[PDB]
Amino acid sequence: RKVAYLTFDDGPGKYTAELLNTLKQHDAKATFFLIGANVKEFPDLVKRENAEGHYVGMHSMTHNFAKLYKNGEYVNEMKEDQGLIANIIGKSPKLTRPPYGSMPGLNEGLRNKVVEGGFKVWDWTIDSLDWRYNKMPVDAAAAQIAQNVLTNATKPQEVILMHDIHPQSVAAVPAILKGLKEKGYEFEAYHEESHFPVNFWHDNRM
Ligand SMILES: O=C(NO)c1cccc2ccccc12
Ligand SMILES: [Zn+2]
């Protein structure tokens, strides 16, 4: 059993409905890490993500490196974001995705605060590099993003970093799905009851 975990950061946004339709058309489930301001602007998309079998988790309020890590606001922001999501879907998610990744921002003390707050942390195993092709022609960029993902996929479990707020990322998803299905991956959402650690610190507590 090989499982691919597509994860989408920084939304919701104006390409998210299209992404959801694409995922549904391929019966794929994915994971979304949402920014609080966008949760407030797009509550219907938050509802739809959760209703259609995807995992909805937190990606902070400010996405501000200095505030989250140096000033130590990571857990406070994730808790605030958690509440905004819970207001819509009636569930308080536990999984967080650190802006800029956990390394080196989430130091010793912050990782303890995460655990003590009942949160988990997922980084990723495959970076799609989708930001490299920002503002480039969409279909060509998508093909390049798909090959970035497809070649890096080797392990039984892969967690793939993408951003649904960018057109070229959403456009890459059909080719990614096809390419990974051929290699025997199934596409699942994150599952709180089935947590396994995926973080740059190899901290098995989060
Ligand atoms: O937060 C991120 N993913 O959404 C993220 C991870 C790693 C590096 C970054 C650099 C600039 C902006 C964001 C990131
Ligand atoms: Zn981000």
PDB file of C-alpha atoms and ligand atoms in Angstrom, residues 9-10 33 35 59-60 63 97-101 161 163 165, ligand 2:
ATOM      1  CA  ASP A   9      -1.405  25.605   1.679  1.00  0.00           C
ATOM      2  CA  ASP A  10      -2.429  29.268   2.013  1.00  0.00           C
ATOM      3  CA  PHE A  33      -3.969  24.059   5.457  1.00  0.00           C
ATOM      4  CA  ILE A  35      -4.923  30.878   6.674  1.00  0.00           C
ATOM      5  CA  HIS A  59      -1.690  27.339   8.518  1.00  0.00           C
ATOM      6  CA  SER A  60      -1.775  30.259  11.030  1.00  0.00           C
ATOM      7  CA  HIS A  63       1.906  33.701   8.133  1.00  0.00           C
ATOM      8  CA  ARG A  97       1.376  23.079   8.865  1.00  0.00           C
ATOM      9  CA  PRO A  98       4.075  25.596   9.814  1.00  0.00           C
ATOM     10  CA  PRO A  99       4.528  28.566   7.545  1.00  0.00           C
ATOM     11  CA  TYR A 100       8.073  28.248   6.090  1.00  0.00           C
ATOM     12  CA  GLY A 101       8.260  24.729   7.545  1.00  0.00           C
ATOM     13  CA  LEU A 161       3.537  20.481  -0.727  1.00  0.00           C
ATOM     14  CA  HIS A 163      -0.485  25.847  -2.876  1.00  0.00           C
ATOM     15  CA  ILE A 165      -3.873  29.881  -4.321  1.00  0.00           C
TER      16      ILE A 165
HETATM   17 ZN    ZN B   2       2.297  29.103   3.457  1.00  0.00          ZN
END
